[PDB]
Amino acid sequence: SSGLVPRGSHMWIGVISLFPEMFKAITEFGVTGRAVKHNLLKVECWNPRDFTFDKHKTVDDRPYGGGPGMLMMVQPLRDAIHTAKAAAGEGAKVIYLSPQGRKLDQGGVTELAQNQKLILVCGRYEGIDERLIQTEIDEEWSIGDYVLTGGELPAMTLIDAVARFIPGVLGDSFADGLLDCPHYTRPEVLEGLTVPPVLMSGHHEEIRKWRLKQSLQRTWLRRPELLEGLALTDEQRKLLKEAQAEHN
Amino acid sequence: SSGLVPRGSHMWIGVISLFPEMFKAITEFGVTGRAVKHNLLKVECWNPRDFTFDKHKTVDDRPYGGGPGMLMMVQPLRDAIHTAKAAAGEGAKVIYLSPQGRKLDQGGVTELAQNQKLILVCGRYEGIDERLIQTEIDEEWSIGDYVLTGGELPAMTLIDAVARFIPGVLGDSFADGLLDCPHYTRPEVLEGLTVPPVLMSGHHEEIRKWRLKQSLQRTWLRRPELLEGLALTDEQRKLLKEAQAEHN
Numbered sequence: 001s002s003g004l005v006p007r008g009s010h011m012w013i014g015v016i017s018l019f020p021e022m023f024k025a026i027t028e029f030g031v032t033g034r035a036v037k038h039n040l041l042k043v044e045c046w047n048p049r050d051f052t053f054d055k056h057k058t059v060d061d062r063p064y065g066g067g068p069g070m071l072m073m074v075q076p077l078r079d080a081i082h083t084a085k086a087a088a089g090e091g092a093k094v095i096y097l098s099p100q101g102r103k104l105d106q107g108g109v110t111e112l113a114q115n116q117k118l119i120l121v122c123g124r125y126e127g128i129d130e131r132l133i134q135t136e137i138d139e140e141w142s143i144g145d146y147v148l149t150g151g152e153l154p155a156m157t158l159i160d161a162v163a164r165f166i167p168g169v170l171g172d173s174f175a176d177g178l179l180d181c182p183h184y185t186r187p188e189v190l191e192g193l194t195v196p197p198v199l200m201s202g203h204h205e206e207i208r209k210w211r212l213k214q215s216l217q218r219t220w221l222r223r224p225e226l227l228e229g230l231a232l233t234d235e236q237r238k239l240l241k242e243a244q245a246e247h248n
Numbered sequence: 249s250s251g252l253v254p255r256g257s258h259m260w261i262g263v264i265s266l267f268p269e270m271f272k273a274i275t276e277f278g279v280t281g282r283a284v285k286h287n288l289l290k291v292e293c294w295n296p297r298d299f300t301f302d303k304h305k306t307v308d309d310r311p312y313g314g315g316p317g318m319l320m321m322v323q324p325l326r327d328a329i330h331t332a333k334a335a336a337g338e339g340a341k342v343i344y345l346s347p348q349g350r351k352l353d354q355g356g357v358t359e360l361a362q363n364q365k366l367i368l369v370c371g372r373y374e375g376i377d378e379r380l381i382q383t384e385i386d387e388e389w390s391i392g393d394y395v396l397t398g399g400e401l402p403a404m405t406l407i408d409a410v411a412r413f414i415p416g417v418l419g420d421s422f423a424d425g426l427l428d429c430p431h432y433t434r435p436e437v438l439e440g441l442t443v444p445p446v447l448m449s450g451h452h453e454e455i456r457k458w459r460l461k462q463s464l465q466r467t468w469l470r471r472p473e474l475l476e477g478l479a480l481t482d483e484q485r486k487l488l489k490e491a492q493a494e495h496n
């Protein structure tokens with residue numbers, strides 16, 4: 001392991017997945033791809049398929065009590081987890097991604113990003129045996145109240161979200177707990193819509209206050225529950241009241 | 249376009265992305281990969297890079313009013329959107345994935361899945377010009393209250409979630425508005441933990457009621473706000489009260 005890029009806060013993420021090639025979407029492209037090449041982020045996959053012993057490499061099994069779907073077969077999945085934990089050494093927290101988990105939000109991303117090592121277990125079918133949660137999983141997390149064909153997209157979502165908090169990965173995330181303000185680039189006029197003159201003014205302080213007021217107004221109109229989680233600054237209370245008066 | 253697999257409800261999804269190779273994670277693997285091969289789901293990508301005219305194929309641009317980040321360059325992105333809309337023909341709703349969007353949940357997935365054609369616009373950098381939202385985007389959606397390096401993982405998350413509602417894709421999603429019950433597979437005993445005897449009984453009705461009670465108990469302990477959105481059946485009111493009495 002070598003290179004010139006400061007990597008003091010580098011993260012290691014082990015992944016248990018039946019489809020490790022999915023992870024190329026994050027390891028080979030964009031900002032996450034650069035993090036991996038610069039050794040700020042390492043993503044290491046184990047496939048339960050490689051832990052099977054039968055001729056057909058069976059990775060699913062029938063649920064007790066019947067019902068329609070399959071579960072991940074215990075022995076191959078358990079063996080893959082044990083191999084990832086041995087590789088990771090001490091301090092690796094094991095995360096299972098499921099709709100039954102703790103709801104991920106940006107605060108939870110920053111809590112997760114304090115871990116120098118994670119193992120992300122990706123369930124396929126109707127998920128994993130309850131007893132493996134009890135014996136192998138440190139924390140269960142959901143990316144949101146929907147059901148996907150597997151935990152791989154949730155795992156990749158968490159990796160990407162945490163990676164942004166690794167110093168050096170980026171070249172301001174829900175700034176102030178608010179929805180982000182509108183942004184504008186060239187051209188000055190688009191389908192008769194003009195860039196707000198304040199953004200053209202060069203007045204750094206008036207621009208700051210316009211963006212903060214817009215963020216407060218958009219949070220209030222779209223996601224008012226997000227305001228209730230906040231103790232607004234004096235300046236923020238005044239800009240919201242001005243945006244609420246102007247709306248009315 | 250041909251094949252034997254019933255595809256009456258087939259979905260077409262256009263995608264605008266600087267990294268269309270990311271979409272292989274859904275189009276080449278698992279249940280979504282099978283949907284694509286069977287013509288239940290088509291995913292068609294346009295890359296704004298192919299709509300550039302400068303020697304360096306520039307796809308970012310500086311925000312008006314300064315600040316740290318870049319935006320997607322308007323002309324290449326707008327041209328890619330127009331080409332996707334012409335390809336899609338009439339009835340294609342254009343979705344922009346952003347943290348400022350409507351929060352996706354399973355109900356919203358099923359609303360989105362009523363569309364036979366979607367175009368998913370994937371923003372990189374600090375996102376897209378506000379005026380393109382106004383002029384090109386039908387609906388803005390978030391997959392959750394976190395910030396990612398791009399809209400591609402959110403787009404792939406929505407495709408996967410909607411695909412499950414396409415008849416024939418699957419071989420019961422938040423059944424009853426509740427968190428799913430525990431599942432068990434072989435072996436009968438794992439690290440001294442035994443499968444609940446009821447699941448071994450063959451008694452289809454007692455198994456149904458045990459799984460419903462567990463789902464009510466887990467929703468109540470982990471996500472009690474989910475119970476408030478529900479008008480529980482008589483049977484559900486009785487099983488929750490029994491689980492709440494047994495907890496206490």
Ligand SMILES: NCc1ccc(CNc2ccc(C(N)=O)cn2)cc1
Nearest residue numbers: 097098123126127142143148150151
């Ligand atoms: N029956 C439980 C179960 C467990 C695991 C799966 C795999 N797919 C997932 C995993 C996580 C999420 C999420 N919202 O973070 C969504 N879909 C499905 C079902």
Ligand SMILES: NCc1ccc(CNc2ccc(C(N)=O)cn2)cc1
Nearest residue numbers: 345346371374375390391396398399
């Ligand atoms: N500054 C606004 C903005 C817009 C678009 C992006 C691209 N990344 C995204 C897109 C969608 C989501 C989400 N939660 O669904 C998360 N991250 C970033 C920033």
